[PDB]
RNA sequence: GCCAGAACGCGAUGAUACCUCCAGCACGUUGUAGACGUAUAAGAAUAGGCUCCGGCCUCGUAUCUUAGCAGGCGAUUCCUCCGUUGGCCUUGAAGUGGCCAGCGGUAAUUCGCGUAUUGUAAUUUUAACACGCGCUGGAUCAAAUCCUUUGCAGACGACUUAG
RNA sequence: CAUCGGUUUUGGCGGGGGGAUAAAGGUCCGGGGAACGUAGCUCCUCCGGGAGUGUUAUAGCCCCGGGCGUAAUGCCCUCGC
């Protein structure tokens, strides 16, 4: 039998907004990986898929487990934090959940 | 401090198991029925168990006291019920001290002295809602004034915009607890004697 | 004995101290400059320990137990990498410990998805002989 | 900022009574050549009386370090305006190169005196060709006999992203 | 997560790959070339005929008889695989898999399955 | 990063800790400080204790019962303070952020045998200059009304005089466990095939 | 001005055992053994030469060289106090009142009590309790002189102004009420 | 020392009827400030430390674990690793870990058979708690309140009593 | 997903021009100097140094000029991918 794990993708967390301290824009959200602490290595997820991933309290479609969709648009700041945008704005109840960066369509 | 184990003797009398109930005249008297087989089962090694757990431990140890009330001239059955803490040596003399005291009645004369000095406790004489001259006795007003003599004419300033704390305000006054101090005994006298 | 006292003897910042720069190169100190800047040179033939002649910041480097022995204050370039060469420091350096761990890291970074696998599959059968030897050990104890 | 030295020559345009006007050299350390000809203008106008309007800028050229790998001693000389006066001081840096020395100054002297580059005007810069030429304690101490010293604690350098450490960092680097 | 051997580009980001039947289980099979990593261990392909992989790279091989084989009105059993593509699939992995066991390694490391663990960062990592 | 982070709080600044446990609590990480008797405060012991002291002139006048400060007193509750003024407490985002956070004295179970992690960034012996003055919360809080000060130092020596049986325990398995690597009979290949690969 | 070095050399008698563990300096001599605590300074010891200890400061700003040669004479008064010991004298002053005083070591602690009686006029008692390691004695020599002996100089200092610092007076004037114990001489044993 | 006691702070103890409680198993959730290896215990100094006493110390860029239908069925082969049940000992800071018995499963090495068709990506629906339903094996047969009464108390509640 | 269009962001590559046609720098050939004075030598200690003489010696350093050399690097400005 098999004693490994089975993740396919890297770890990230859901930090805020885009904001300028008064206003927020929920249209971008910053999201920081795991690992990730520069620029030069945020340029590598660069497009890369990124899925928040929740439960409710329904079952549609045979299941309960739902999924928002996004990518990495560009990074933000100095410190490997990027900027993402999803399908519909992330939830404001989500700040500091966890989100899978999927290594979707690569470069290399 | 955290209160570890308790330890209880058997054969508790009914003036302590009257404490346990507020409706001990229609109830099972069902009060510490199961634990008495902790005493009695296993050679009492439950409660051998505890009392190695109190010395091993515990560094205050306290016994469950208990007065006779049906002694006295009192229409109360309830006994009432304290914690008194054994002072003294080491925490294993402590336990020894209070083990062998388990249901052995305990006299003032050996707590106290003839010539001591000690601490009075106990509840004031309560006077229910009164006003604010018996609660603070503050100055009575003058005969003149129009609503009400027993006041105080100024509870607080335009600023601070509040009635502080430590304005003279009607409300209770006795029955509260309260600790005097540094009472002499000048006598301990025996219940049997004809000439005490 | 007379005086028993302990130890913190640091390593000098001396003309001749070989000092390890940002990136793993190397550079003797031909001059001081100020207590937190000095004048180095780096003349190695390897291009990963050779260092431009120039003026770099203490704050920036590790100091080396390796030291040029008696290297002229201010000397050039070519009289610094003749005691270079005389003092042996490239060939002390390779069996410098510090030397040992960088090759180390480089080794681990370059793997491949093959070569980390390959890693798994020695390391397991080697864990396999060191837990035979390690229970015999504890029950012959 | 960071400064290199300019020698900008400037001159009166003629005029029919002046057909051939004098010409006036000056060693300016400016951080770019807009502002080593307004310097130039500046310490003009108050010494020789010449105006931007009237006159010309004849050349703005920039002077190199010929020796940049040599470590050499400084002497410098300049004027400020404090808060309440204007005073004449003397210090000395230990660099590479003159532009070197005067980028230290003005740090120096916007640390010590709170003078700032408007106060300051750099009378002379010269390098001081021996040591009993130094006449300064802060530089008499780092050209001794032998000098060779420790670095006592010496904090680690830690990445800042790496916010949790495992064991204790030691200050013996 | 399996890893699988490149046949041939085909066309748009369509790859052909096989990861052979009996090493890993992964079928002839088409796959968007955005949804792969491309690593830097190459299995030679002497012995494997082109001719057989074209014909097969030629579209509607795969898609043949989807929409004939759609049944779904109920002991489930699993959908019997054309005993074409069987065949065809059988006569490619007899040169690949003798060519992949010359390699110490590489017909258990095809058998596995790839997985992050703590501390591997893919951005640094190299293939 | 990981699940629960376990911070020694032996040797820290009270300030710099706290600025980065907040952000750290705030990005949805859990932590665990303890030993917060023996944080540190910059500057000498007596400009600290009178920090505290205008501190505890301050407070509700018409009714001391309500409306705060709330003057707490023990160590781990001075750190709790500063760590609250860094959030936005009156949030339910902020007050989720603040139940992540676990502040104790000592090193109370089961945090007794978990690993304790540092920070650099905080840590007293390398922000400051050698010379300067130092106090620690420990000590401001006994003189300012905390009562657990020996009860605390007690429960320490247990647990340092428990621990430290275990580290000879430790120091047996590392020296078994050096022995059975030096004994172990290991293919050659291996040996610099792994020595190639780095490990 | 940061110094690039400063340095203080301290010359150790043949018949004296010095050690320094981390900056706790003990010293072992034959009159016994006395153990001072230096962790508040940032300093460097080190051997120079066949029984010299030398003290250096790598980088100080004029306030830290000044604890230099501070350390330099507390670690110099240990040796002396280990070999030829700390003695002070102290003499009676009065005017009109005896003082009578009486010394004995207590049982339980150790130290010398000094119990000082009549003071001007006073009915009051002054118990001073010397330090650790500090013997009193009263003088045959001289009439009205006290004895502190001891090989620390920081307990035989403090232990003579504890006594003159109970001795003082109150709302009289001290110009003209010059009554107490003042300290004479500071010599050594030997 | 003394007064109050958080009515959303906590501990010990006694008895707990029922639509009950304890343990195990099984299934499910209109539950989750948000699992995916969610692995890692000396103490202390920092102008000094660790040690297997041989030596070592910027560096957790480390160590363990890490392959197999989300991980099958057999074979060859090695006594490693993991989980669980029972017994003994031990841990009180908000009680947890250690030796031994049995049972169960296991690539250090090498293979054979099965995967396909989810059709070119669509969370990888699987963990841990909490709760509910049910079954099995045991255990128990209680109080408080209203009411009448008391006056050490009371505006009314409340409180001290007694039935 | 592939191939395009518009805007934009972030990297990398090749080639030109300019300044003292960078200044430096390496090697070689010349001239002139000194010390934080290298060898040698003269003194006291001589475990360890200090003092003097001594201008390259059994280390070197500073200044000026000239070949290799139309050297390289660096900064700025540019033509493209
Ligand atoms: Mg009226
Ligand atoms: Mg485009
Ligand atoms: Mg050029």
């Known amino acids: 039998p098999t004693e490994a794990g089975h993740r396919l993708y890297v770890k990230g ?61 560009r990074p933000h700041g100095n410190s490997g934090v990027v900027r993402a945008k999803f399908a519909a704005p992330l939830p404001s109840r989500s700040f500091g959940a966890s989100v899978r960066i999927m290594l979707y369509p690569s470069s290399i | 401090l955290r209160s570890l184990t308790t330890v209880w003797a058997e054969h508790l009398s009914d003036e302590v198991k ?116 018996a609660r603070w006795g503050t100055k009575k007003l003058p005969r003149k004034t129009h609503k009400g003599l027993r006041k105080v004419a100024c509870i607080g300033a335009w600023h601070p915009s509040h009635v502080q704390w430590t304005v003279a305000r009607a409300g209770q006054a006795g029955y509260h607890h309260r600790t005097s101090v540094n009472h002499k005994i000048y006598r301990i006298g025996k219940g049997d004697a004809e000439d005490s | 004995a007379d005086i028993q006292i302990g130890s913190s003897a640091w390593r000098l910042v001396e003309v001749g101290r070989v000092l390890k720069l940002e990136g793993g190169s190397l550079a003797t100190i031909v001059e001081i400059v100020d207590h937190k800047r000095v004048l180095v040179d780096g003349p190695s033939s390897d291009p990963k320990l050779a260092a431009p002649r120039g003026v770099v910041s203490l704050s920036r480097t590790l100091l080396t137990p390796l030291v040029v022995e008696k290297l002229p204050r201010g000397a050039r370039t070519g009289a610094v990498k003749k005691a270079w060469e005389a003092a042996g420091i490239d060939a ?5 410990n510090w030397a040992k761990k960088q090759l180390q890291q480089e080794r681990r970074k370059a793997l491949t998805d093959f070569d980390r696998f390959k890693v798994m599959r020695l390391k397991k059968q080697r864990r396999f002989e060191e837990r035979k030897a390690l229970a015999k050990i504890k029950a012959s104890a | 900022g960071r400064l290199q030295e300019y020698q900008v020559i400037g ?15 000056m060693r300016i350390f400016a951080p770019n050549a807009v502002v080593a000809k307004s310097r130039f203008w500046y ?60 980028e230290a100054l003005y740090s120096d002297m916007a640390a010590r005196h709170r003078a700032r580059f408007r106060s300051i005007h750099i009378l002379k810069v010269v390098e001081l060709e021996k040591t009993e030429d130094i006449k300064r304690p802060y530089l008499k101490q780092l050209v001794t006999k032998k000098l060779s010293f420790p670095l006592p604690h010496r904090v680690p350098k830690i990445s800042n992203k790496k916010i949790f450490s495992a064991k204790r960092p030691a200050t013996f680097a | 997560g399996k890893r699988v051997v490149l046949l041939k580009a085909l066309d748009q980001g369509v790859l052909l790959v096989t990861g052979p039947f009996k090493i890993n289980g992964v079928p002839l099979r088409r796959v968007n070339a955005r949804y792969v990593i491309a690593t830097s261990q190459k299995v030679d392909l002497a012995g494997i ?42 006569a490619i992995d007899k040169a690949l898999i003798a060519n992949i066991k010359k390699v110490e390694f590489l017909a258990s490391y095809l058998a596995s399955s790839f997985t992050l663990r703590k501390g591997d960062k893919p951005h640094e990592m190299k293939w | 990063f990981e699940s629960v982070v376990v911070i020694d709080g032996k040797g820290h600044l009270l300030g710099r800790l706290a600025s980065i446990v907040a952000k750290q609590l705030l990005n949805g990480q859990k932590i665990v400080v303890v030993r917060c008797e023996a944080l540190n405060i910059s500057g000498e012991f007596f400009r600290a204790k009178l920090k505290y002291h205008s501190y505890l002139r301050k407070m509700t006048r018409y009714n001391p019962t309500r409306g705060g400060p709330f003057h707490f007193r023990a160590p781990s509750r001075i750190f709790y303070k500063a760590v609250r003024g860094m959030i936005p407490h009156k949030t339910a985002r902020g007050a989720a952020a603040l139940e992540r956070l676990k502040v104790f004295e000592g090193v109370p179970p089961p945090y007794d045998k978990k690993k304790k992690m540092v920070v650099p960034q905080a840590l007293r012996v390398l922000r400051l200059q050698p010379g300067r003055k130092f106090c620690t919360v420990g000590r401001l809080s006994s003189e300012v009304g905390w009562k657990y000060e020996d009860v605390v130092s007690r429960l320490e020596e247990r647990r340092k005089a428990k621990g430290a049986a275990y580290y000879e325990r430790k120091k047996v398995a590392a020296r078994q466990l050096s022995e059975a690597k030096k004994s172990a009979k290991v293919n050659d290949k291996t040996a610099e095939a792994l020595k190639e690969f780095g490990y | 001005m940061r110094y690039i070095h400063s340095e203080e050399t301290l010359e150790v008698p043949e018949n004296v055992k010095v050690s320094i ?62 070999t030829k010991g700390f003695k002070y004298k102290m003499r009676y002053v009065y005017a009109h009142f005896p003082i009578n005083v009486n010394v004995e070591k207590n049982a339980e602690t150790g130290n010398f009590e000094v119990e000082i009686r009549n003071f001007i006029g006073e009915k009051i008692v002054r118990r001073v309790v010397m330090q650790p390691g500090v013997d009193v004695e009263i003088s045959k020599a001289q009439k009205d002189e006290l004895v502190l002996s001891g090989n620390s100089l920081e307990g035989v200092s403090q232990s003579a102004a504890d006594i003159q610092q109970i001795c003082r007076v109150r709302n009289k004037d001290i110009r003209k009420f010059l009554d107490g114990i003042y300290v004479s001489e500071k010599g050594n044993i030997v």
Not at chain 1, 14 to 22: A, D, E, K, T, V
């Open chain 7, 21 to 82: 563990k981390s900056r706790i300096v003990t010293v072992e001599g034959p009159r016994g053994k006395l153990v001072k605590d230096l962790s508040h300074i940032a300093v460097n010891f080190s051997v120079i030469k066949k029984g010299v200890i030398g003290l250096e400061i790598h980088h100080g700003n004029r306030k830290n060289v000044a604890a230099l040669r501070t350390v330099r004479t507390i670690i110099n008064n240990l040796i002396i106090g280990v």
């Open chain 4, 11 to 25: 001159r009166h345009l003629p005029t029919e009574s002046n057909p051939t006007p004098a010409l006036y050299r």
């Open chain 5, 49 to 90: 005929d082109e001719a057989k992989i074209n014909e097969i790279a030629q579209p509607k091989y795969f898609t043949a008889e989807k929409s004939k084989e759609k049944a779904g009105e109920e002991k489930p059993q699993k959908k019997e695989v054309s005993s074409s593509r069987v065949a065809d699939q059988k």
């Open chain 3, 92 to 96: 002390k350096w390779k069996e410098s």
């Open chain 4, 43 to 102: 310490f003009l106008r108050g010494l020789r009386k010449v105006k931007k309007a009237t006159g010309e800028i004849v050349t703005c050229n920039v002077i190199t370090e010929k020796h940049p790998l040599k470590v050499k001693n400084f002497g410098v000389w300049i004027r400020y305006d404090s808060r309440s006066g204007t005073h004449n001081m003397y210090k000395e840096y230990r660099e590479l190169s003159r532009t070197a020395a005067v």
């Open chain 1, 13 to 73: 967390r859901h930090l805020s907004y885009q904001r300028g301290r008064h206003t927020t824009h929920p249209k971008t959200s910053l999201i920081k990986i795991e690992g990730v602490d520069d620029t030069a290595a945020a340029n590598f997820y660069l497009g890369k898929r990124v899925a928040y991933v929740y439960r409710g309290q329904k079952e549609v479609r045979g299941t309960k487990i739902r999924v928002i969709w996004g990518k990495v648009t």
């Open chain 2, 18 to 133: 009257r404490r346990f109930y507020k409706n001990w005249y229609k109830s099972k008297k069902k009060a510490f029925t199961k634990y008495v087989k902790k005493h009695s089962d296993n050679n009492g090694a439950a409660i051998t168990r505890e009392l190695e757990r109190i010395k091993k431990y515990c560094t205050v140890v306290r016994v469950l006291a208990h007065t006779q009330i049906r002694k006295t001239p009192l229409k109360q059955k309830k006994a009432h019920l304290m914690e008194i803490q054994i002072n003294g040596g080491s925490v294993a003399d402590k336990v020894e001290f209070g083990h062998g005291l388990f249901e052995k009645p305990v006299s003032i004369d050996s707590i106290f002295e003839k010539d001591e000095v000690i601490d009075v406790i106990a509840v004031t004489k309560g006077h229910g809602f009164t006003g604010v001259t």
